[PDB]
């Protein structure tokens, strides 16, 4: 495995439902690679939120920020990385979505008020899954 995920920081958390996701990603690349990394963020209520390409992959330990666009109960976000279109790591988080204030939570409206939803990504409980792939 040439590339390894070393850590993820969920920077803006808690945030509003409509706020973008700002992640700090730390990874290590042991050797020179021919192709691109693609980092992807997926919403699971389902829809791909955003992605970012890194190419050529800088060797060594690298730290970067990934700003993913927002989407449109408890839900899940998946942060994955692929090399040359082959997925080798995935990090899943559970997300608690609740209303701003006491009365909205107890008496929620029929037509949901997106602007009053605060999401809280449970960043201490990531599910990390690795897959072995061909590299170069």
């Amino acid at each position: 495995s040439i590339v390894s995920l070393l850590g993820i920081k969920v920077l803006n958390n808690p945030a509003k439902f409509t706020d973008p996701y700002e992640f700090e990603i730390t990874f290590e690349c042991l050797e020179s690679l021919k192709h691109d990394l693609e980092w992807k963020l997926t919403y699971v209520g389902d829809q791909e939120l955003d992605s970012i390409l890194v190419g050529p992959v800088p060797v060594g330990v690298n730290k970067f920020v990934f700003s993913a666009d927002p989407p449109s109960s408890v839900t899940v976000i998946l942060l994955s990385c692929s090399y040359d279109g082959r997925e080798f790591v995935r990090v899943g988080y559970y997300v608690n979505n609740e209303y701003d204030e006491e009365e909205l939570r107890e008496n929620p409206p029929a037509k949901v008020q997106v602007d009053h939803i605060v999401r809280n990504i449970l960043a201490e409980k990531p599910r990390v899954t690795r897959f072995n792939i061909v590299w170069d």
Epitope: P14, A15, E22, V54, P56, F64
Partner: antibody, heavy 118, light 108 residues
Framework: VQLVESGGGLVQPGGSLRLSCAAS????????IHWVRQAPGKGLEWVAY????????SYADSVKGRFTISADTSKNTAYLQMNSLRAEDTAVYYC????????????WGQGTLVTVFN | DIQMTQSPSSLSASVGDRVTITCRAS??????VAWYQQKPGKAPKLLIY???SLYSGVPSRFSGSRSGTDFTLTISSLQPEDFATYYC?????????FGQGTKVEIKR
Amino acid sequence: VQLVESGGGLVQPGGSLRLSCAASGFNVSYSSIHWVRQAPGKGLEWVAYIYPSSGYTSYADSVKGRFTISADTSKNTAYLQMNSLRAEDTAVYYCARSYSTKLAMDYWGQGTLVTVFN
Amino acid sequence: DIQMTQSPSSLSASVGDRVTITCRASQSVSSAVAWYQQKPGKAPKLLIYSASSLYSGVPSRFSGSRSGTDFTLTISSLQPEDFATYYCQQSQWYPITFGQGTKVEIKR
């Protein structure tokens, strides 16, 4: 939306100084607060940022280990604690806000001067 | 480690001219690039973010574009208030870095 800085002025090498950044018109919890400095006649230099929501920070190589950024959400205010000051830290220090701009700074304070004199 | 190499350091132009400022990322950057305007003794002001998104209230004659690792700021038709210093910025990689800046001065 205002960012008001305070705490600048004169200080000696090795001494310390605390800058404040009071925010009005928005909740700092939903943004990141940044410090940018500009030495006299020089270009902009990014210093540090903090996400008050998570407490996560980042420091420029020139100040890491010497400056510490922090925030108090209940007061809607951010701080830059500057220790082990050197002459080259003399500069105008700006406070700035980033919100939904991929860490671009959309609002800036007017700046406060920090002068390190022997 | 990443550098944002901004060029030219200065350029002379006239009212109405189309000017171009370039800023080269030393390694790949997706979109987290911004452009700022600073006038003497004043706080900088955000013009472009996300490489090409015009910030609210900024005149449309400022536009940002990209070609590979080259990030460009274009001022179509300079106005007298546009003569100033301009800075690029990247905020994808640690650490956030500004370019060295470009003076846009008046030709006479």
